[model samples]
Target chain A: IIERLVGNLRDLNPLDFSVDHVDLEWFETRKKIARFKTRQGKDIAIRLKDAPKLGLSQGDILFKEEKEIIAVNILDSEVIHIQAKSVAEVAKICYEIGNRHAALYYGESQFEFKTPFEKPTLALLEKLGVQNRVLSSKLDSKERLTV
Target chain B: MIIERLVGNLRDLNPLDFSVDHVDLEWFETRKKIARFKTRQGKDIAIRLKDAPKLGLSQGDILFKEEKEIIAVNILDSEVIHIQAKSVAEVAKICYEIGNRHAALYYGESQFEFKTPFEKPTLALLEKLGVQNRVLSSKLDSKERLTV
Candidate 1:
């Protein structure tokens, strides 16, 4: 068990370490204190001191031994993916979605994005004449709308 | 005198056929149903469009009509933060921020830029996002304003 997970995986210098992952659901990444089990069946408790300033993210280094590192792995969930081609189209989409105060997240491509799956949101996008899809995918909460 | 009804707008009327005087108004000032304004030619005009549905004045909207002479309202240019993004994804993020701030937005003529009334905080937000933006004076076309 660990009291605090200080550093991220990217910040660490080049080194060789065996990684164990703890799968988290999309929304669970925002939890400040929670107990999770690593793939190797080890118990871990996360009570971040910078809980207010930071949240758990994919690839967050939770524990580290001489040659082993434990990391976070986000699981896939249902989301509405918007496929917009033009800037105007995207702007209209975003403005409408923001007006609804819904959470939006970036997608794999520059002109793609995702929002939590909602029936009304689907109808709105269809009325806007844009292509959309409902799929299960890892939601990246890192680069998302502030609203 | 009282101007009760809108006698059609200048866009559909021939300017050469009618001698016209104009009243310049800000975008927000166009919502008045009853008000007093002075034409550029010094004519005191009183608006009383009491039956107008959702009254809003647009540029070229005739306030008064007399024989061949007319008085029309002109929407004045406003200082706004204009933003242009490179891709749809970028534009989506930028527009989301603007809508979140509760500011009325206007689509530019070119379709490549988006404009909103200038605010210090919104300017700072665009700066923080590193989006391409600038503050400039431009007429906010009433027809171009976006609404939910």
Candidate 2:
């Protein structure tokens, strides 16, 4: 099992190496240490010992060899969708959700934002009195909130 | 000095006949209904407005009044992050982002402007959003509070 990441997958040409894929949940990408298995059934252990500026993202290569690579593929998860009706409403919703310290992910469609679906988050939305929907979707950690 | 209630605000008292003393307050301290402080003239002051609402305090609010002397509020200047948005949508986004950070926010003097206490990380977030923001020393008056 590999305990460290070699590098990012974007730096290397895919044609130069055979890629092994590891599916990760959105929350798992933030874990400093974890045990994961690739689609090829390869075991991997990740231990980021230092203070990391951020968590893992897509195309993070956990293992790299002369012509072989193992990379992360984020899995889809259920999330709450908020479609803002007006600019004022957008600010109100964003502020309320942010005040709760919940991560907001910006979506490309309809100026909507999404958050991971959890009971507490759902309650917060209900308390906020905004319209929301729950469904499964891939969470792009790239669009995740830093603040 | 014992102050039982608010006599009036200095903003409307135009005669300027009485000597004015000031009790300085920070931006965050304006919301206290009862407190003790020393005035600029080094006079002891105690404020306990028993009948006052939670409106807190504001600049130029006269807490004590005498025939020839008055004590007023003076909100101090604070270091903060100033943000100006090009559009209302951006304002919403930026305000939301700041709120998510759990920072205290205040309305700016101009349109589409907002302010918060200065923090390094929030500046980075503003840069990422391509929003115009900077750190500066500015006055945060209780009158401009953006509490929703």
Candidate 3:
């Protein structure tokens, strides 16, 4: 098995190279070290030995090699899609979201926001009483918001 | 109060699909509800997107549509400054201060990127608060949420 270490990510545009990578579950992404194999039949030990491991998302690129680039393909997971009734609700929802420092993605329609399905956040949404739905989709990129 | 649209008239030039304008907007200026800017060649320009597009205009994004003539935004790149924090305490402090100012912070390759050309004091404050930073010319990316 070809072993590779991926420790680089950037807003890179010229490099079209990658060795191998794995699809990670949203929960699996919380840890710093992992061992997995890529589709190309290569084994990789992603160890952040001394450095801090990043909370990587699906679209977050990680490595660039001699021929191609490697990108994350996060597995499907649960998320809460919230729809505010009015602009005021949007403001309030966004305020609390920012207050909690939750990652958020604005949906295609008006006053819609998508975020990971954390139980705590779900409770918050329940209390807020805004219309919401739970669905399974790729844990796409969102702002790692701060409250 | 009703939302107001800010409009301006500019003498058109050869702005085209290949990016005809380079808008130098700081992170702070990018989060506002409404804003306008001028080109280096004295072309008055206006921006008014109400929907707060999930993909808010970022540094490299071009403005306007395929209407006959369009002015591209040349997002200026520069050495804003860099701050790295490995702990939650360190991260929260910087984010809270910068968030209150509503400036833009991007998830760069290694460290979070912060810029405030108008608020020079912010950089000074970060230094005093024990933020080890450096200056380098780099293009920053946004979450494209704050419909600036």
Candidate 4:
């Protein structure tokens, strides 16, 4: 039943969904596209048609099929390092990291990663490195007994 | 002829313009006064009332009139960036960058900066970075320096 519902939802475009005034404006402005779930996962796709309405000078639209999400806010300078196989993967990673940070900082899960580019990745990687180092150091100090 | 037609459209479509909500408009004075009443989506314009004649804007004088286009990315705060250019081709460049970088970063996201009640240089920096505008409050308490 869930699969059927999700499939039906995917078939429907965002325009059909009831949206708030802000969302409506966002849709009109082309800042956000529609978010839907696929067999793989939740995916959000940024609408390319609305690029001009938004104030971005350059970028691409990526869709993650597994995550059922899309992103349209990657910068050119950051693209030199990392490569994304599909838009879906980028969307999923962004959403995942964003949620993690939001949960950490705001005590709420309101944040979602929007950019699956290199610069943010570099920043996230650096953060992860620090976290890993701390964890490793803590584990190293723990006294263990052989069983 | 085209300019005249555009002006006519502006005059005719004046009532159809959208108004801005939740966005505060302040004058360019030393301590600018906040304008009351937000503009609707299309109605919000940035007009130089004094320079109307020079710009050839007659009829009610529009400041920065624009139409909502597309949703790109949500920048810092809750603000979502929209495509509002006259041509899609012009907007494509930004979209491509966003997509490419997003893919390269593996979807890790971070706030460009904290929210500000009023527009600040950092906000401009975010714009320079090509991120979208979200909700920034003055209560966040940020200061600026003229030197840097």
Off by over 4 Å in 4: A1-9, A12-109, A128-147, B1-117, B120-148
Between candidates 3 and 4, the lDDT winner: 3
Q: Estimate each model's TM-score.
A: 0.73, 0.61, 0.35, 0.16
lDDT tens digits by residue: candidate 3, A1-147 = 212325444454444455345688765664456667766766666655432233566544445556665555678878788887864455446545555666666565666777788887788888888789999976543333322
Error of 3 at A139 (Å): 2.3
| Candidate 1 deviant stretches above 4 angstroms | A1-20, A30-35, A38-41, A47-69, A126-129, B1-17, B31-57, B63-67
DockQ comparison, 1 vs 3, better candidate:
1
Which segments of candidate 3 are over 4 A away from where they belong? A1-21, A27-35, A39-41, A45-70, A97-103, A118-120, B1-148
User: TM-score-based ranking, best first?
Assistant: 1, 2, 3, 4
In candidate 3, how many Å is residue A146 off? 5.2
lDDT for model 3: 0.55
Give the C-alpha miss distance for residue A146 in model 1, angstroms: 5.4
lDDT top scorer: 1
Ranking by lDDT: 1, 2, 3, 4
lDDT tens readout by residue for model 4, A40-109: 3444344444334332211121332443433222112211122233333333323334333311101011
lDDT of 1: 0.79
How many clashes would you count in candidate 2? 2
**lDDT tens readout by residue for model 1, B42-121:** 88888878665353677888877779878888999989888887666667878888878778787876656888999998
lDDT of 1 by residue, A48-90 (tens): 7665333466777878888889988888888999888876677
- Write down the worst ten-residue block by lDDT for model 4 chain B: B139-148
TM-score of chain A of 4: 0.18
| TM-score pick, better of 1 and 3 | 1
Task: In model 2, state the lDDT of residue A134.
Answer: 97
- Backbone clashes in model 2, listed as residue pairs: A98-B100, B1-B44
